[PDB]
Amino acid sequence: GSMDYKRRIHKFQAHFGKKGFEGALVAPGSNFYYLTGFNPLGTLERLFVLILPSEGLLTAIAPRLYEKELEEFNGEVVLWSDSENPYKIFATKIKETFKEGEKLLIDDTMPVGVFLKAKDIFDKYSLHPISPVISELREIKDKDEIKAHKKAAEIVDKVFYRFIEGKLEGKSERELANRIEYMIKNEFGADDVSFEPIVASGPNGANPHHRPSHRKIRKGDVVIFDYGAKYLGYCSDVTRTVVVGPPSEEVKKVYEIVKEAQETAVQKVAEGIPAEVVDATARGIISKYGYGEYFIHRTGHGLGIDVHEEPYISPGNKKILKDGMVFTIEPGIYLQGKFGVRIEDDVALVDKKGIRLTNADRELITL
């Protein structure tokens, strides 16, 4: 990836050098990768930290066996071995640190412990979550991050067509889900899935929180797939709904409703118009046709390094949509004991307009 980081850091530094904070501690994860491009794979019990100061060159703490995949670094570097004790490697640092009793930011994501076990020696400051600050620089993507997103939407587009060519009758929701994960990953530059694929078939479609089960796919089933890829660590997220064998008129009716709702809501995305009104566009269409009480979630959510992040396209939200924002548009109708239908696309706001990054056929296909 062509992105910088040094600027991201220095306007993160200068977003509390613009809100008054004296610290921010981060560990392997989204905020980490976003701030460095590095993602150390396989940590836990094994302390790994980057402290971010007033403003200036941050820090890097080990452990040893990671260096020969740490050929370059700025703020660097210090190494501890499978013999030395961390927490007491906050020794000087620890202090450094900063004045006893001033402000600090920590990863919400990260477990305490790697903190509790510091104690002595780390109950001498005013700590407060990191998300409210770093969030507002992640919620605006740069040109390159958009390229990561569109590229991620591309892989998943390719996955859709390859997949519906396959045979679905007789395989279980869990098989299909695993095969979809294998499809994604056997493509580049998929690093990985953005989340474990979801396959919801038959009346399991009416359950938004469905997790693939053992139920085999059979003629007459409407089957929802929901899955995603990572490209240079940026996430896609797509949902399509198919029918196995001729659909009923009620399925045909409900599908079109969800199609139009989604399409009109996509068209409505624009720099300057609130999140909730994009929810309302979608929600209003479903309602006009009677299914208002069967649309039982928000219309979409932000994508980024995580599959769920800002902006959140919800009925109670007047955040004003802005250039660089990336999110999902995904209304659905859910009919308990019958079936569900959701159609979900990834959208990025460029040059005042909402552009779809995912482009796979949004018409009801019969398999």
237 is in an annotated binding site: yes
Q: Where does the chain break, by residue before each gap (C–N > 2.5 Å)?
A: none
Q: How far apart are CA 343 and CA 341, in angstroms?
A: 7
Distant-in-sequence, close-in-space partners of 5: CB < 8 Å, separation ≥ 6 = 35, 36, 37
Q: How far is the CB of 308 from a copy of itself (least distance, A)?
A: 5
Binding span for a copy of itself by CB under 8 A among 112-120, 142-150, 157-165, 359-367: 112-120
Which one of a copy of itself, Zn ion, none interacts with residue 145, CB within 5 to 8 A by kind? none
Alpha helices for 271-334 (secondary structure H): 275-288
Q: Minimum CB separation from a copy of itself for residue 267, in Å?
A: 23
With CB under 5 to 8 Å by kind, the binding choice for 182 among a copy of itself, Zn ion, none is: a copy of itself
- Count Cα neighbours of 80 within 13 Å in the Cβ-side half-sphere: 18
Among 102, 142, 175, 323, binds a copy of itself (CB under 8 A): 175
Site string for Zn ion, 223-242 (x = CB under 5 A): ---x----------x-x---
Q: Is 229 exposed, middle or buried (0-12, 13-18, 19+ CB in 10 A)?
A: buried
Compute the C-alpha angle 282/222/240, nearest 5°: 50
Q: Does residue 42 belong to the site contacting a copy of itself (CB under 8 A)?
A: yes
Give the integer Cα–Cα distance in Å for 117 and 127. 16
Residue 169 known to bind ligand: no
Residue 344 marked in a binding site: yes
Give yes or no for residue 11 binding a copy of itself (CB under 8 A). Answer: no
The contact set with a copy of itself (CB under 8 A) reads 29, 41-42, 44-46, 64-66, 68-69, 82-83, 106-117, 119, 122-123, 127-131, 174-175, 178, 181-182, 185-186, 188, 192, 195-196, 207-211, 214, 296-298, 306, 308-309, 314-316, 336
